[PDB]
Scaffold this active site. Structure first.
Site, mmCIF file in Angstrom:
data_model
loop_
_atom_site.group_PDB
_atom_site.id
_atom_site.type_symbol
_atom_site.label_atom_id
_atom_site.label_comp_id
_atom_site.label_asym_id
_atom_site.label_seq_id
_atom_site.Cartn_x
_atom_site.Cartn_y
_atom_site.Cartn_z
ATOM 1 N N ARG A 49 0.819 -1.214 0.000
ATOM 2 C CA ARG A 49 0.000 0.000 0.000
ATOM 3 C C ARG A 49 0.851 1.262 0.000
ATOM 4 O O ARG A 49 0.439 2.280 -0.570
ATOM 5 C CB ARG A 49 -0.961 0.014 1.195
ATOM 6 C CG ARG A 49 -2.103 -0.982 1.051
ATOM 7 C CD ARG A 49 -2.879 -1.129 2.357
ATOM 8 N NE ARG A 49 -3.900 -2.170 2.270
ATOM 9 C CZ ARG A 49 -5.174 -2.017 2.614
ATOM 10 N NH1 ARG A 49 -5.644 -0.859 3.057
ATOM 11 N NH2 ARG A 49 -5.996 -3.061 2.534
ATOM 12 N N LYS B 244 -22.021 -17.874 0.879
ATOM 13 C CA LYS B 244 -23.365 -17.501 1.312
ATOM 14 C C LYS B 244 -24.017 -16.558 0.314
ATOM 15 O O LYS B 244 -23.429 -15.534 -0.047
ATOM 16 C CB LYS B 244 -23.335 -16.840 2.692
ATOM 17 C CG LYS B 244 -22.890 -17.765 3.810
ATOM 18 C CD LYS B 244 -23.448 -17.323 5.147
ATOM 19 C CE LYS B 244 -22.908 -15.969 5.572
ATOM 20 N NZ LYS B 244 -23.235 -15.694 7.006
ATOM 21 N N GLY C 167 -10.190 -7.750 -3.265
ATOM 22 C CA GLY C 167 -9.078 -7.095 -2.598
ATOM 23 C C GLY C 167 -8.205 -8.118 -1.901
ATOM 24 O O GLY C 167 -7.786 -9.118 -2.497
ATOM 25 N N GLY D 252 -14.871 -3.482 0.912
ATOM 26 C CA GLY D 252 -16.281 -3.176 1.050
ATOM 27 C C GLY D 252 -16.713 -1.984 0.222
ATOM 28 O O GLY D 252 -17.832 -1.961 -0.295
#
Lengths: 411, 412
Positions: free
Chosen positions: A43, A211, A364, A388
């Protein structure tokens, strides 16, 4: 809405100008042993193109970033000290670290910056106002951040992983200064637009994971945008149950069956289910793999991967796509005997990309675990790392850290 | 009187209906950009299963102690083991109950109520400040409370290797209170590290990368009397090249380590191997103009960003001759395609050698990021160590406290 980018800011001029940059410097740290050891500097490397462009143009650069999720103020394990050292090495110049966020030291160091200097504030989440749900709290911190660069300054948002929530350094400070998307945020927006609003067709989506409830938002949003949505992974057995098929001992979200039936009834022929299944009598790597039809899963077996007939049909689908989005494994790829479905679709997507398809890998950091199978990142057009935030974009939610960048510049 | 008993030894003593306290490595990476509680790599949970499954199947009442992150001072909701309990239960095919405290009212009640085959995960052991205390009395007080959860007839299994190099209550002091054993992961890691330090098939080739000499200094000086070759790449090779008296331009340079590298090059002239060429550029950028230059002739306004093709060929041949290989650290800035060749080539050479029979060990978080990014399957190495500092200190020649304590005689 007009989201201006770093090139627009550089064209206006930043020589001698204070520029506040929200960077993604949330590198993993070793928390088995001694504090302050970065275990993956990726990063930091990704943050360099925005920062280096501003430094070379002569900006006075103040960087806000977070490390982890500090519970209640300064936490020595989450100090940005190792980040400032590593960032300076990659920037080729010393990066000052303030001993506070917007206190005495930050103010003194910001006042002393000269053209091309870089100041990293301490971990922005040490300040309780940074993540506050209270707008007035965030505004108070945002005003202090803006004062560090001054009323002639500018704001550059370059951390995509935080743009989906209102945080002072991401959202509120953008209302106080002329605001721009940094190179990373601009690139992620440009990619996500090709998967939602401006899609080259055929557009094939490949969704896995365990899920349906976790994927429902993305499925429903993309079902009106994509030509096909391939369903694999553990969640596919809930769709197969919604088809009226028994699924033996497979993973089953019983409360989502009627929802899967609604999806199959509403978005007719978009959803593509497995036609065969690799099943086993137990959840073990050495369990004898049995390839069964998707409509004839035996009562005593659990499905652990999509079968070769499914990989064949899905591969043919992907070979005709102009746009491909892939998020999630097709089976229990940790067991080598049940990795074939995941490896097979990875190879199909890479092959299509080499022949001109635009392919985006979602997930990610989570998706990197799949790449333990031997899947080079260069085989795909773009690896999304927005976590997210990227998923909420695909679900069609408005992201406050993106929306604010599209507002007119403050006067 | 030193014998580190293993899980097979404990099972042979019998664990049916017996409380067994297991220290597991469940310190999985979490997303800390967005909402709390999201695991981004469950590898450590997967790795923990064999020890736990063996105890469950043998009828043990299993109490698991583990940490997540480094809580500053007490409970931290972002570092609760709740998502770990859920994920661990899914992999075990059985419910894993989370206690709402560490050694409090709930942990006590649930440990007392455990029945054969049940698994109880205590809350994050580092929520108790005594767990990491330097003060022995504080750690021992917590250790006594942990041992009480499994009772006087209980046993202790140490199965988190990454914490055995520092004294922690759940790793070290509690092993003094109960019959004590290395779990399957700790026993395996010790066996691997023994090959890398003591007896192993020769030739024995070591490859070390990464940015800082000082991070690898102890390992280099320890392994230089053991390995047949030590390849130096990555950012740290430029400090060695400077130690030889060559200029290295704008390359990364640990000036405080130059004299040390010179001493190492003099003493271990026959062991240390430096690159013979370098890929350099004028900017730290993926699209900088690359030049392939001899390692002893780096231009003044360039920075070295990868080992060169002649180096890759030489190191590949060396690895193709090795029966034992240890690799830790990238050879260059592999995040940039133009500077990934050295890391890709070396990792591919190790996998090729392993397929032909070599024993290969990989360590380091940056090595793992590289193999994942560059498409080399993890299954292509004999062993991927996740031990971190603990593995490095073992390789430096330090006996580790969490291993020493397991070798003490069992209680009589």
């Amino acid at each position: 809405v007009a989201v201006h980018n770093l090139k627009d800011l550089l064209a206006e001029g930043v020589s001698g100008r204070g520029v506040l940059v929200r960077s993604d410097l949330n590198v993993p740290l070793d928390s088995d042993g001694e504090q302050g050891r970065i275990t993956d500097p990726g990063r930091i490397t990704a943050s360099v193109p925005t920062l280096s462009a501003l430094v070379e143009a002569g900006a006075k650069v103040v960087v806000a970033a977070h490390l982890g999720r500090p519970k209640n103020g300064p936490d020595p394990a989450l100090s940005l000290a190792p980040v400032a050292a590593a960032l300076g090495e990659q920037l080729g110049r010393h990066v000052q670290l303030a001993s506070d966020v917007v206190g005495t030291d930050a103010l003194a160091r910001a006042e002393g910056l000269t053209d091309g200097d870089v100041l990293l504030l301490e971990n922005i989440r040490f300040d309780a106002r940074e993540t506050s749900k209270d707008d007035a709290e965030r505004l108070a911190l945002a005003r202090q951040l803006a004062e560090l660069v001054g009323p002639t300054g500018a704001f550059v948002s370059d951390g995509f992983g935080v743009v989906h929530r209102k945080q002072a350094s991401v959202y509120d400070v953008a209302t106080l200064l002329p605001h721009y998307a940094g190179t990373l945020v601009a690139e992620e927006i440009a990619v996500l637009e090709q998967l939602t609003g401006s899609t080259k067709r055929p557009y094939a989506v490949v969704l896995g994971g365990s899920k349906v409830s976790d994927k429902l938002g993305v499925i429903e949003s993309l079902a009106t945008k994509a030509d096909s949505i391939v369903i694999g992974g553990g969640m596919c057995f809930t769709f197969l149950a919604a088809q009226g098929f028994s699924v033996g001992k497979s993973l089953l979200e019983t409360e989502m069956v009627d929802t899967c039936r609604r999806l199959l009834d509403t978005y007719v022929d978009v959803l593509r289910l497995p036609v065969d299944i690799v099943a086993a009598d137990r959840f073990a790597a050495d369990a004898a793999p049995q390839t069964v039809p998707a409509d004839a899963i035996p009562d005593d077996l659990m499905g652990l991967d999509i079968g070769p007939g499914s990989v064949k049909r899905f591969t043919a689908l992907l070979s005709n796509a102009e746009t491909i989005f892939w998020n999630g494994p097709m089976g229990v790829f940790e067991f080598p005997a049940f990795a074939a479905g995941t490896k097979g679709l990875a190879e199909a997507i890479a092959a299509a990309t080499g022949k001109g398809a635009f392919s985006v890998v979602g997930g990610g950091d989570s998706a990197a675990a799949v790449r333990a199978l031997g899947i080079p990142e260069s085989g795909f057009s773009h690896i999304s790392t927005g976590g997210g935030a990227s998923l909420e974009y695909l679900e069609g939610k408005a992201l406050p850290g993106i929306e604010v960048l599209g507002r007119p510049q403050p006067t």
